[PDB]
Every structure is written in C-alpha cells, then in structure tokens.
Design a protein around this ligand. Structure first.
Ligand SMILES: [Zn+2]
Ligand SMILES: [Zn+2]
Lengths: 154, 157
C-alpha cells in the first residue's frame, strides 16, 4: 500500500481542521489511530456545541473510547493539528494514549512543550510520548483564522 | 426592593450538596467526587465522576457539571458562576475552569497526586491566562475520608 506515516495521518487531521474552519470554529482537527487504523476523527466544536471543553482532542478521545468500548486508549496514537492545550494534554494522560503527534505549536495554551510540559511531569503514572512534526499548512490555517476573527470584529 | 430576597447559602452548605453527589458516585462504584455550579446562589448543575459508567476517562464531576451548566444557560462562558467540588480539581478540570471562565472554584479536600490548583501544578495561578479563576480550599475532613474509604475498599478486593 501507499505510505501512511506521520505526514499522512496529520494530513487526515488537517481535513478535520478544514471542516472546523468551514464551520466557523477554531481550526483544529484530531484523529486517533490504532495499529494503522483510524479509530476516530473530530474537530474543535466549541461554537456549535456551546461547550468550551469541546476541543478536537476531547471529542476524538470520547469517540475512540466509545468505539473500542473502553475507558483507556492503550496502544493508540493521537494526531492533532495544533499542540494540545493544558486541558487536552492531561486528558491524554488520563486516557493512557501511547503518543501524541502535532503539527504546530501553541505558545499561549500548549501543555506539551509551551506553557507546561504536562506529559513529562515525573509524578505521572503513565507516560504519554510525544512528537512535534511541523507542517506549514497547520500554522497557516490558524493564521487565516485569526485574520477572519479580526475582520469580524469592528 | 419590590420582591423578596435573601442571602446566598453558605460554602459549607454547597459543599455538602456536592458531597451528596460524591456519595452517589461512591455507591455507583466510581471515584467519589461530586461537583455543582452555582450562579447567584442558585444551583445550575450537579454531577459526579462517571468515568466507569460512561467508559469515558474525561467524565470527571467538574467536566460534566460545566457542560450541563453551559447548556442550561445556553452559553460557553460561565461568567459569574462558582463551582463547588469535593476534591481539588485535577489538571484537566483545572484548565477547563479557565476555558469556561468560571469565577471561582471552592474545594473541600486536596489531591496530592493529580491536584491542579495547589498540589501538582498551579494551573489557576498561571499569569499566561487572560481570565483568572479564583480558588478556595474550604476543608471538610468528611470529603477526604470519603476518598480514603473508596481507595481502601479498592485494595480490600
Ligand atoms: Zn484542548
Ligand atoms: Zn478532573
């Protein structure tokens, strides 16, 4: 088959971020993969669900747990278009995700390499591995979103 | 001054309502944590840890209560709301308070292991946040004992 590595799965996540952008949401997409199979896909849906916690990662985790009928996502990898925020980073620990791969950094809310290094905190019983795999399109989606925000505010 | 008015119930009263939710969790076989959201003295939502029932690692009491309050008030921001929880919010829930713009969180026991307010991380006192969530540790030993009893019934099986 064709190459289904990190760029491929992040590209799939980018489609979810695109969908979010089209829906007027902050453009972040996430997918959960287990043994090369996509288990769930989700996008930031804060605006449509009127729920500040409805970040892509959170929705993806809930759907994966629902499909696998399990509270833990051991052996699963999460691919997200933007570095997970503090809330989502700890959700990864709680769900026991194996690894998270992200394509852009979040300087003000990131909980992996930016504001806090939540995933590397010693006290943690389960250790979520991570990888920053930058993709130009992920950052451009965010930059375009903020240009739209400015234009929509007098 | 044309209608009746009264003082809002006290912190102990609301924490006791939360403890009731926590006991329900205990009886349902989950981590015994309960939480409620109050706005202008009125209880908007109540919830308890439902991770096992829902098979959802994110279903902590605070998360469920916030989602329910946002839905009942038809808004993503809970400005003016206070959250009472029987255990110090974990890191995930602590930031959820920030994202939801909750005004203050009041808790009755500490979580030395996952605590995100004063124990592991001080998520609320992070000057990076635009919204500052106020917090208060209002100790009630009964809340700590409920958690200890749970963990005890854990090993003893
Ligand atoms: Zn997040
Ligand atoms: Zn929590």
């Amino acid at each position: 088959g064709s190459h289904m590595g990190k760029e491929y799965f992040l590209k799939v996540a980018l489609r979810e971020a695109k969908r979010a952008f089209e829906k007027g949401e902050v453009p972040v997409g996430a997918i959960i993969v287990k043994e090369g199979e996509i288990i769930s896909k989700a996008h930031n849906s804060v605006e449509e669900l009127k729920d500040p916690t409805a970040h892509a990662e959170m929705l993806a985790i809930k759907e994966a747990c629902r499909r696998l009928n399990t509270k833990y996502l051991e052996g699963c990898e999460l691919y997200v278009t933007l570095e997970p925020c503090i809330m989502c980073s700890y959700a990864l620990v709680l769900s026991r995700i194996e690894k998270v791969i992200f394509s852009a950094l979040d300087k003000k809310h990131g909980g992996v390499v930016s504001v806090f290094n939540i995933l590397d905190e010693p006290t943690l019983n389960h250790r979520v591995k991570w990888e920053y795999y930058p993709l130009e399109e992920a950052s451009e989606l965010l930059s375009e979103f903020f240009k739209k925000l400015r234009n929509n505010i007098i």
